Design an enzyme around this catalytic site. Sequence first.
Site, PDB file in Angstrom:
ATOM      1  N   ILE A   1      32.196  97.444  24.212  1.00  0.00           N
ATOM      2  CA  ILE A   1      32.085  96.376  23.110  1.00  0.00           C
ATOM      3  C   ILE A   1      30.934  95.776  23.546  1.00  0.00           C
ATOM      4  O   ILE A   1      29.803  96.007  22.951  1.00  0.00           O
ATOM      5  CB  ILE A   1      33.339  95.096  23.151  1.00  0.00           C
ATOM      6  CG1 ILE A   1      34.662  95.940  22.852  1.00  0.00           C
ATOM      7  CG2 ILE A   1      32.885  94.327  22.046  1.00  0.00           C
ATOM      8  CD1 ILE A   1      35.821  95.248  23.122  1.00  0.00           C
TER       9      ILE A   1
ATOM     10  N   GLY B   1      33.073  89.156  30.208  1.00  0.00           N
ATOM     11  CA  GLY B   1      31.788  89.827  30.673  1.00  0.00           C
ATOM     12  C   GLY B   1      31.752  91.469  30.488  1.00  0.00           C
ATOM     13  O   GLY B   1      31.139  92.009  29.741  1.00  0.00           O
ATOM     14  N   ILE B   2      32.929  91.978  31.123  1.00  0.00           N
ATOM     15  CA  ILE B   2      32.773  93.704  31.018  1.00  0.00           C
ATOM     16  C   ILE B   2      34.208  93.843  30.331  1.00  0.00           C
ATOM     17  O   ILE B   2      35.253  94.112  30.775  1.00  0.00           O
ATOM     18  CB  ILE B   2      33.000  94.145  32.366  1.00  0.00           C
ATOM     19  CG1 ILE B   2      31.537  93.698  33.492  1.00  0.00           C
ATOM     20  CG2 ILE B   2      32.981  95.744  32.469  1.00  0.00           C
ATOM     21  CD1 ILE B   2      30.442  94.355  32.690  1.00  0.00           C
ATOM     22  N   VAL B   3      34.128  94.453  29.054  1.00  0.00           N
ATOM     23  CA  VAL B   3      35.177  94.711  28.057  1.00  0.00           C
ATOM     24  C   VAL B   3      34.925  95.860  27.504  1.00  0.00           C
ATOM     25  O   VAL B   3      33.708  96.388  26.788  1.00  0.00           O
ATOM     26  CB  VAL B   3      35.276  93.581  27.164  1.00  0.00           C
ATOM     27  CG1 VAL B   3      36.473  93.692  26.185  1.00  0.00           C
ATOM     28  CG2 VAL B   3      34.925  92.121  27.586  1.00  0.00           C
TER      29      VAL B   3
ATOM     30  N   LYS C   1      39.568  94.149  29.628  1.00  0.00           N
ATOM     31  CA  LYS C   1      38.438  93.167  30.350  1.00  0.00           C
ATOM     32  C   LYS C   1      38.570  93.410  31.875  1.00  0.00           C
ATOM     33  O   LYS C   1      39.710  93.283  32.204  1.00  0.00           O
ATOM     34  CB  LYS C   1      38.599  91.817  30.072  1.00  0.00           C
ATOM     35  CG  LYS C   1      37.533  90.934  30.511  1.00  0.00           C
ATOM     36  CD  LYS C   1      37.326  89.611  30.118  1.00  0.00           C
ATOM     37  CE  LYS C   1      36.106  88.891  30.722  1.00  0.00           C
ATOM     38  NZ  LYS C   1      35.969  87.325  30.595  1.00  0.00           N
TER      39      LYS C   1
ATOM     40  N   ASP D   1      33.570  73.902  26.785  1.00  0.00           N
ATOM     41  CA  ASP D   1      32.749  75.215  26.746  1.00  0.00           C
ATOM     42  C   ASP D   1      33.008  76.211  25.634  1.00  0.00           C
ATOM     43  O   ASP D   1      32.718  77.439  25.704  1.00  0.00           O
ATOM     44  CB  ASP D   1      33.039  75.910  28.156  1.00  0.00           C
ATOM     45  CG  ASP D   1      31.827  76.933  28.665  1.00  0.00           C
ATOM     46  OD1 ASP D   1      30.538  76.593  28.064  1.00  0.00           O
ATOM     47  OD2 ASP D   1      32.041  78.002  28.996  1.00  0.00           O
TER      48      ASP D   1
END
Length: 332
Positions: free
Chosen positions: A26, A27-29, A44, A140
């Site tokens: 598509i 952090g690491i997904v 993820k 955030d």
Amino acid sequence: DNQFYSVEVGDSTFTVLKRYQNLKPIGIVCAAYDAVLDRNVAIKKLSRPFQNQTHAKRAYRELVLMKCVNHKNIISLLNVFTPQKTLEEFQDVYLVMELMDANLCQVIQMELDHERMSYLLYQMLCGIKHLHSAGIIHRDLKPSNIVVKSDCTLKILDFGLARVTRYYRAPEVILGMGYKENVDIWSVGCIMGEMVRHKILFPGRDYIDQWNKVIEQLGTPCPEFMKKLQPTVRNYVENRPKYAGLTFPKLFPDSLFPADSEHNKLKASQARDLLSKMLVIDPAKRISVDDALQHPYINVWYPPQIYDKQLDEREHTIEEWKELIYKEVMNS
Ligand SMILES: COc1cc(NC(=O)c2cccc(-n3ncc4cc(Nc5ccccc5F)ccc43)c2)cc(OC)c1OC
């Protein structure tokens, strides 16, 4: 063992249960098809989230909140797993949830639509309200970690800060002033205003030019506010060129909105009004979640659990973080 296979995704390797097939980035997904469930999912990878005490407290908190905060506008997990067989060998954590269609960043790029915008804001406020209710003040929030399906249902993906790019962070956070619930309101305001402008509102080039772009537009705060500032931060801000700012019609002119009907004029007025109540530097003058939800632009859209505070308090050795996390992953 034979329950897993590996596949390259970008620069990394995903080692996942065989039920998860056709991984596409598509952090690491990645997007994957879950063959057992006959459904698409998002997966993820947290890689060595125990990299240090900071990566670790976040990973642990996040994992715990994802399985205890339950609300339609908040992330819920379908699955959690690690390909490693023992605490000793333990390295990676994989989180699996429903596959959505896009995040807010793409949505922001669409032409302005009041029904859609007020709908997305409604859900965002509702998520935040529930977070606050569950003892989480986020601080955030950002368009990149909020996702939506094509029917415009929305989910917040993470749980914010413990306890360079700061475009969405409230002034009281940027200046280390301590905070309350309405700190999340500033972020929603930044997001709303970006949907109107199709450009980031306060694109600071450094974590101090950030403050400059805020005052340039909204105006220097009144002096009452600068008192709450620490001796060294107060010095900077107080002894600094005063800016008048722009009124809200000028920050967000008619031309950015649908027009040529009184309904569209009504809608542009309501939106600027709401904007002018959220983008307020001084948190003591900024609208609350409850009030934002009652606002004419928003209100047309109509229990939590006892927060474990040790979740934030207790610090640990890297070895113990690893064991806490591993234990959480193993209790599916
Ligand atoms: C070709 O691949 C497809 C992709 C699409 N939607 C996209 O591309 C897309 C865009 C933006 C965001 C998301 N999306 N959805 C869930 C999601 C979760 C995370 N993060 C995360 C994951 C698990 C646990 C905790 C987490 F914080 C990040 C982005 C995410 C998908 C649709 C599809 O069909 C429904 C696809 O075809 C199978």
